[PDB]
Amino acid sequence: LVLSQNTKRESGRKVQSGNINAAKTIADIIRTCLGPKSMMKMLLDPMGGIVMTNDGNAILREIQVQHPAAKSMIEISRTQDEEVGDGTTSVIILAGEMLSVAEHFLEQQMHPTVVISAYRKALDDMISTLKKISIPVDISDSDMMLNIINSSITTKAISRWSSLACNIALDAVKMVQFEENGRKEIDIKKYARVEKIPGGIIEDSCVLRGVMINKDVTHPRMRRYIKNPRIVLLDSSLEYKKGESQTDIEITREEDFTRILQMEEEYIQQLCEDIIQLKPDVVITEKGISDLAQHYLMRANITAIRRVRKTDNNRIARACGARIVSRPEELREDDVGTGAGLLEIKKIGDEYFTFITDCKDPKACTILLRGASKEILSEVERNLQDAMQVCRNVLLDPQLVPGGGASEMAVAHALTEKSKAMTGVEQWPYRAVAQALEVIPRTLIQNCGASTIRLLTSLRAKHTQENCETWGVNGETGTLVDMKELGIWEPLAVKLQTYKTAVETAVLLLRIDDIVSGHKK
Amino acid sequence: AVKTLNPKAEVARAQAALAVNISAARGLQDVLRTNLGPKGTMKMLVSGAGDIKLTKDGNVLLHEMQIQHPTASLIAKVATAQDDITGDGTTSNVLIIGELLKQADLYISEGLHPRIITEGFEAAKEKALQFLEEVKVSREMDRETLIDVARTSLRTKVHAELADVLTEAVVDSILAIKKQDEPIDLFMIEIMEMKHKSETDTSLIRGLVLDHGARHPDMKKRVEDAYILTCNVSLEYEKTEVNSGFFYKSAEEREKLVKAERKFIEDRVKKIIELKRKVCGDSDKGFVVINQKGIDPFSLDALSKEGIVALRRAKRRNMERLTLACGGVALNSFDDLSPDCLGHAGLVYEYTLGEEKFTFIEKCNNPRSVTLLIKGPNKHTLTQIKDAVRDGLRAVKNAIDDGCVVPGAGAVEVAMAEALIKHKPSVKGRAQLGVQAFADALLIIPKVLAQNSGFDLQETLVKIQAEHSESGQLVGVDLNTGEPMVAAEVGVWDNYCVKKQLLHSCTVIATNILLVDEIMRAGMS
Amino acid sequence: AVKTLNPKAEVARAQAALAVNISAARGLQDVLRTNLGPKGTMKMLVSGAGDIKLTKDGNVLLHEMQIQHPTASLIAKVATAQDDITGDGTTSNVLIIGELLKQADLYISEGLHPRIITEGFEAAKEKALQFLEEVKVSREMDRETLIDVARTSLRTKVHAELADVLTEAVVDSILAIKKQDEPIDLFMIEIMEMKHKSETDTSLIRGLVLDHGARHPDMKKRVEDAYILTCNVSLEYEKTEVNSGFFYKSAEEREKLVKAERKFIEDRVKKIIELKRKVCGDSDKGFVVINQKGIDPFSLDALSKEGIVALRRAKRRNMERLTLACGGVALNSFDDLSPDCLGHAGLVYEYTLGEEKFTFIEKCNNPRSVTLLIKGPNKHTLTQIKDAVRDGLRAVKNAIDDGCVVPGAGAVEVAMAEALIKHKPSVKGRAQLGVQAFADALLIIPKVLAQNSGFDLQETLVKIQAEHSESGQLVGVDLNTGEPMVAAEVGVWDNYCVKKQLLHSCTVIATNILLVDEIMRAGMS
Fold this sequence. Notes:
The structure is cut from a larger assembly and holds one copy of chain A (521 residues) and two copies of chain B (525 residues).
Chain A: E1 9-11, H1 12-28, E2 41-44, E3 50-53, H2 56-61, H3 68-84, H4 91-103, H5 112-132, E4 135-136, H6 142-153, H7 162-174, E5 193-197, E6 206-207, E7 211-213, E8 225-226, E9 231-234, H8 255-277, E10 282-285, H9 291-299, E11 303-305, H10 310-319, E12 342-347, E13 352-357, E14 366-370, H11 374-396, E15 399-401, H12 406-420, H13 427-437, H14 439-448, H15 452-463, E16 471-473, E17 480-482, H16 483-486, E18 490-491, H17 492-510, E19 514-516
Parallel strand pairs in A: 5-14, 9-10, 10-11
Antiparallel strand pairs in A: 1-19, 2-3, 4-15, 6-14, 7-13, 8-12, 12-13, 15-18, 16-17
Helix pairs in contact in A: 1-3, 1-4, 3-17, 4-13, 4-17, 5-12, 5-13, 5-17, 6-7, 6-11, 7-11, 8-9, 12-13, 14-15
Chain B: H1 14-32, H2 58-64, H3 70-85, H4 90-108, H5 114-135, E1 137-138, H6 143-155, H7 160-175, E2 191-194, E3 204-205, E4 208-210, E5 222-223, E6 226-231, H8 251-279, E7 286-291, H9 297-306, E8 309-311, H10 318-326, E9 343-345, E10 347-353, E11 356-362, E12 371-375, H11 379-401, E13 404-407, H12 411-421, H13 430-442, H14 444-453, H15 457-464, E14 475-477, E15 484-486, H16 487-490, E16 493-494, H17 496-514, E17 519-520
Parallel strand pairs in B: 2-12, 6-7, 7-8
Antiparallel strand pairs in B: 1-13, 3-12, 4-11, 5-10, 6-9, 10-11, 13-16, 14-15
Helix pairs in contact in B: 1-4, 3-17, 4-13, 4-17, 5-12, 5-13, 5-17, 6-7, 6-11, 7-11, 8-9, 12-13, 14-15
PDB class: chaperone
Keywords: tric, cct, reovirus capsid, chaperone
Entry title: Human TRiC/CCT complex with reovirus outer capsid protein sigma-3
């Protein structure tokens, strides 16, 4: 017994093949999942539930593996999925075939490292190529976004609900720009809360100018409906709290026990009049509520809600623009809930809901999802999740690309122009990537169900012409289609990270030459 | 394939998993098709704990029939919404679902791609809903119209006599509910049950009942005229939050501190004691107190000496009901105490059953909250009658909500069917098959009826498949002769949203179900 | 129920087992449907013993695809019968079966009681067979007629080239087979296979080939002119059937006992050699012998010194072919020996392959027994083609057997369909339903043909669903363009009885299949 006592090892071509095989496996289980003609997959969770989604990431997110590079690929998915949302509908699939041809030079006894070098060389050419054939666009023009929005969602089941979602997405993003960074304001996808409520229909689901609380009034008398509410966000609890420093009390005369009892009551009263002093209408706390305080707030005609998640609270704060407070005596009129167009508490059916909309200039809001069932709606928001995602990315970059394989062919021959201009051993790797690129539209045809070879060849033959760069494939016809009229248009950074991530996998995987298990630590 | 990735993993394939789900749902629907319909039969479920059902609302059944097939559980969830939305026709949804896929399979088994048929449904939902939209008969809030739909709903659930008995109760409950703008179905509604003497005698009470009684003998059981204290602040003893253990030197002082401790609560009752004696200077009227928390024994002594009814530990929603019935001003701080804060009822007493106690509140001037008192011979029946009670109430809530009402007995469906069949391939043609298939699925509801009702399916369909003339009427199927019948005249009805929601929901369900390929099972060990 | 009678027993129920069985065939047909049609794919099987298949004829698949579902095993049996009846279309037969049951299910799924539909089938087949009887094309035994039919059949299994090579041999055999009245296909058909040099070079031999060779090196490998000895009596030693203990007293007698023992066989061989020498006084002529039993080496030597070809241990049927080959008079008693009892061949040599020995019979003036020597590159393929061969022959034997012929490729089924769809409810009405599906089920053959050919189904059926005019033709589906085709003009044909029996076979299968309710299993331990 020598090395590690039941830790296996592997080396060389067997290893490299294993990764390639493991890689090749990873893509194909998803190769059907992309396109306007894509499939939609349903999954078995560990814990009993059901998830159905076309977004590959979640599918891969729910995948348990033993092969390491496979686990590597999994993480690769969520990173870009975190990064851009969609294209993971293609991201990994692009990687594996890149590898799939990549192995084709290994038996050529070609050291991968140099094959890596071309891969590096390839990327910059791709990056430069794409920028050349990128398309700047205005951001204020809403309808273009929606087409861009629709284009980005014309792969998911919300295709039939494109118009709403496109509006649904567009409005939500448009109202998110934290301008306190000068002219470098940032939107955030952590305030655009998504709320799934059962019943109703897609059409019933709509964007609400503010936030929703799945709670109910602590006391009946408080109005469930107010025109112009005034709001206080009380981070602190509204009731007596123990003296933190383990204080203790020894009374000697009779009255003190009752007296100290009144004193905490007074302390309660003490807090309230400070609140009523600012003429609020609304009491909000992430904590519980003294009913005795609640009594006086009821006396105050001031509505109170307790025990709310902080995340929503700040959004509530962001909704009416007011700022949260934990110090009632230090309450500031600058944090009044001014800018709440309406307070209401509705009934969805067995649940009270808090309506606070029509803010003057809401920066935060939550979307109310009304559909078929949460898992249906869970799919919906995932389509939303990306749907909002690319939009903000667009608000980062006004540059657009015709995806759908059109840019891809554009890249390919551009490299082919390079490859024949790039004599040397690395040339064959270089043209390999170009040829490797071609599979994504090929998938489309398989997803479409047409003559892939004939279509692609005509496609490639079409794009040998320098005059035309927007020739792509319609998803449903499976015919050569220039993109300008078809309108499937894509943000630059999306495909950027796509290629950007794609290569990083290979080189990372290409260096792999040995296996070691059993760390036991 | 992915077996390469994992050995313990499990995956299906396109034809395979597809075949699974249809069989799953078709298998699912077969079980439940025995249910819906007044001639239908409720089913009895047995817990592994030995508990028992007698229901027909499959939502309970599905929720309680343990299945492992995911799509079925998938079906369970959306239905769980639907019952949370309306309650019945949940039955229809699933039967709608499976037979939809059944016809869908007929075509995909013919090689026809699901996306095409899905799109065939896509329009198919559209045209019907418009037809659904236009055809709803706008009806105003006539009590009897409320009555019959309520009767329509209940006969699916309970005895024709029993339904009729309850049919009166709910609508009278319902009528006493609306503030002409906003019903909530929650507080105005109390569902209370006693294992007592009948199923039929189960009767709505003009007031509210409480699930408990006094905790002292001298409390008078009956109160002729009730003057009401609603409250929630504890009249039990309590000690401050802070470490406050005290000391003494004299047992005489020990008694004094005993006195001091009680005094704060002693003060509390006295205000009530005075205000009571202040308000009820008359001997005749009676005064009662309500606490959602507990009541101290010494406090019990206090009120007993003044004969003031108090109850402790009530459900937090009860006081709302106490308000909406007796107009009592629910309060916490008894210091700011007014006679104006009171509630008044025409009668309050306790009814003792077996070991438990119940407290009766009666004759509010303008009660807005009542109780659906359930008398019970059997526990399961109480539960069994209970959901149908829930089943009816929401329907009436749906009924009042919508100014229209749908003829029941599937009269809608043929109208859609002839309407949908009254669509040339204005569709892209290959889609019309799914449209042709889609309408075919719609006729299932009447089919299961006569299938439940014994009459032969096709011939009954054909005969009822009769728009008569230019007056191709809204025809329900006779529920005892299996004959064409006009539901409107016979007054068999249903809510527009009901029909509205179910198709929409079902449509969404189906397309996705047909739009899955393989079912993967690879999770952590 | 009877679970009461037995705990370990298992029972199904009317609804239950019905679905199970139809589910069973529906799966079964799904796998096999890939095969029939020239574009179809043969399948490869691996034994648990590791053996290998490359087959397409389903009976082989069914017989070797280890399944337990009973109905399939039942269906397997008739398919095997059909294999014992005609050989292919068993393919179609099962595809007919489950698909009928599938269409059958559609109506009972509408609650229709199956008994009615059976009668519809009963009427339906009758009209169909009535049409089937009239529509068969009376055709002579034109070489080309059968040739196309052979090519029609043989393409179902192998390369277009391979069958074309095969086509010539079988038909000429068929031509060289009949005594103008009655074929039996057993003697005159010798199917021998060698792992030799190709698949294609498998050929008819005008003579015969043997599975073994001479047992002596001096034995002549090749002989110009062969005079044939057909026999079965052992020329190995034998000792008589009675216990016959002998002794001797001298070792001289021991040798004298040596010679005596041999003397009997000595005469036996002596009778032949004199006959040979009475026959083959010429040096040029060569003399060959065939025994069904074994031969003594000393006897071998006896022939060896005379340079006599002889063979031992032949299968009991080979001599018939030999008599059907050389006109030789197969005998047992050599005392009654006549030159007229001999057989004559124009050429014989032996072919040595691998370790085995193969022997060659050539140049009968009018051979009446021939051989399908199968040249093979690979063992499975030899087995593979052989099934295709035996199938191909049995096609022809019926083809000659029936002076009529059916144009193939399912042109009949549409013709069946249109005529059957052209049936008013001259039936009692309710049966017209089952007839409708019965007719409906018939179109599967081209459907899968287009399916196996990849062309879209629904449109093509409609296309070919165009009887043109008064000459509403027997129109086939093109097997490579999916287009209307005159099978007769293109010479695509089939055996009438094939079409005859399969309908009958399937129908009887169907009705009983639909006419079971529960599947019992209560057997001893």
